[PDB]
Design an enzyme around this catalytic site. Structure first.
Site, short mmCIF file in Angstrom:
data_model
loop_
_atom_site.label_atom_id
_atom_site.label_comp_id
_atom_site.label_asym_id
_atom_site.label_seq_id
_atom_site.Cartn_x
_atom_site.Cartn_y
_atom_site.Cartn_z
N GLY A 1 2.67 -0.07 3.29
CA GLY A 1 3.02 -1.58 3.81
C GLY A 1 2.67 -2.18 4.78
O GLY A 1 3.17 -2.86 5.70
N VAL A 2 1.43 -1.58 5.55
CA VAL A 2 0.91 -1.88 6.68
C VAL A 2 -0.44 -2.13 6.96
O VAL A 2 -0.68 -3.32 7.44
CB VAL A 2 1.59 -0.72 7.78
CG1 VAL A 2 0.90 -0.69 9.09
CG2 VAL A 2 3.02 -0.82 7.99
N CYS B 1 0.80 -1.01 0.08
CA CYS B 1 0.02 -0.06 -0.06
C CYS B 1 0.91 1.13 -0.11
O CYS B 1 1.86 1.05 -0.75
CB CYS B 1 -1.09 0.13 1.24
SG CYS B 1 -0.27 -0.40 2.82
C1 LIG Z 1 2.55 7.48 9.21
N1 LIG Z 1 1.89 6.34 9.04
C2 LIG Z 1 1.37 5.63 8.10
C3 LIG Z 1 0.62 4.54 8.16
C4 LIG Z 1 0.25 3.80 7.25
O1 LIG Z 1 -0.30 2.34 7.74
N2 LIG Z 1 -0.88 1.68 6.67
C5 LIG Z 1 -1.03 2.46 5.82
C6 LIG Z 1 -1.48 2.24 4.47
O2 LIG Z 1 -1.03 2.87 3.30
O3 LIG Z 1 -2.80 1.54 4.19
C7 LIG Z 1 -0.22 3.64 6.04
C8 LIG Z 1 -0.13 4.98 5.12
O4 LIG Z 1 -0.70 6.27 5.66
C9 LIG Z 1 0.90 4.51 9.59
C10 LIG Z 1 0.72 3.26 10.58
C11 LIG Z 1 1.04 3.26 11.78
C12 LIG Z 1 1.69 4.59 12.41
C13 LIG Z 1 2.25 5.59 11.52
C14 LIG Z 1 1.67 5.62 10.24
#
Ligand SMILES: Cn1cc(-c2onc(C(=O)O)c2CO)c2ccccc21
EC number: 3.1.3.48
Length: 287
Positions: A223-224, A220
């Site tokens: 990548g989470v 994504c």
């Molecule tokens: C800055 N940040 C961005 C993410 C994040 O997680 N999943 C996505 C996605 O792309 O689905 C994103 C992108 O926004 C995130 C998660 C935990 C802590 C900080 C974070």
């Protein structure tokens, strides 16, 4: 299956009390692992988000390039699945300065399938670089030649086919399929379960036709969150079809051990349960 229905109802009781507690029980999993390599100064420009770094113990390594000790780094992590310790590679949306590294990884890890569950721009914010060709003309990404062979744009996703090969051995070309889900808001969930279920099944049926292939790449923006939910859904739909017992908690736990924050929000965790319930109800309807 029949047990999951009662289990989900138990979790949803009292305004999702036990579901929330369960999700909160996962918050610390895997987070005592070091990310020292990702924090090296020469890798700083290679991370899209300061707070989303791969663990040293599970990161994907590129072949070393002479005169550059940090040439092995990419923000990417190996993830186990139902049948392989390295069933998936999860990574960030490539930057302009890392998209050559992204394709190097694709090539070196024998990747035949890429899953993208972010748009390049969302609500005016850059989330991912358009790291694949915009037309049918081939172009080099580093020492790798890439050519888009097809592109089918549907309202909910787009499927593309690329040809990849090294400049030294043009006859050793490989077909790569690219599955781009385009209606999944960042930090959120799709509007229906049916949409992502159909997408996941579409991808899995293609993955299963490449038995000798390396890991499936899923990404994504970070990548989470959306990436973690896709992988969790892929895993549990397989378990359900194999008549095994769905284990959503265990899938997310295992994801967290290998990369931070996988399945980022409680609402994404709820959505995973709703997907399973919806599949069972559609099947129980026949019985
Ligand atoms: C800055 N940040 C961005 C993410 C994040 O997680 N999943 C996505 C996605 O792309 O689905 C994103 C992108 O926004 C995130 C998660 C935990 C802590 C900080 C974070």
């Amino acid at each position: 299956p029949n047990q999951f229905e009662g289990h989900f109802m138990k979790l949803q009781a009292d305004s999702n009390y036990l579901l929330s507690k369960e999700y909160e029980e996962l918050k610390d999993v895997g987070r005592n692992q070091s990310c020292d390599i990702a924090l090296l100064p020469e890798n700083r420009g290679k991370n899209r988000y300061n707070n989303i770094l791969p663990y040293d113990a599970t990161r994907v390594k590129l072949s070393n390039v002479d005169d550059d000790p940090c040439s092995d780094y990419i923000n990417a992590s190996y993830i186990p699945g139902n049948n392989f310790r390295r069933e998936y590679i999860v990574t960030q949306g490539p930057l302009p300065g890392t998209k050559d590294d992204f394709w190097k990884m694709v090539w070196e890890q024998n990747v035949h399938n890429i899953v993208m569950v972010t748009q390049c721009v969302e609500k005016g914010r850059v989330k991912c670089d358009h790291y694949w060709p915009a037309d049918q003309d081939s172009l080099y990404y580093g020492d790798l030649i890439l050519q888009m062979l097809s592109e089918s744009v549907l309202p909910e996703w787009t499927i593309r086919e690329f040809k990849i090969c090294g400049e030294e051995q043009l006859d050793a070309h490989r077909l790569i399929r690219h599955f781009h889900y385009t209606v999944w808001p960042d930090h959120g969930v799709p509007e229906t379960t049916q949409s992502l279920i159909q997408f996941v099944r579409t991808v899995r049926d293609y993955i299963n036709r490449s038995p000798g292939a390396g890991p499936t790449v899923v990404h994504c923006s970070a990548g989470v969150g959306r990436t973690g939910t896709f992988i969790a859904l892929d895993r549990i739909l397989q378990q359900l079809d194999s008549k095994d017992s769905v284990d959503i908690y265990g899938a997310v736990h295992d994801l967290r051990l290998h990369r931070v924050h996988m399945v980022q929000t409680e609402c994404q965790y709820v959505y995973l349960h709703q997907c399973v319930r919806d599949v069972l109800r559609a099947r129980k309807l026949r019985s």
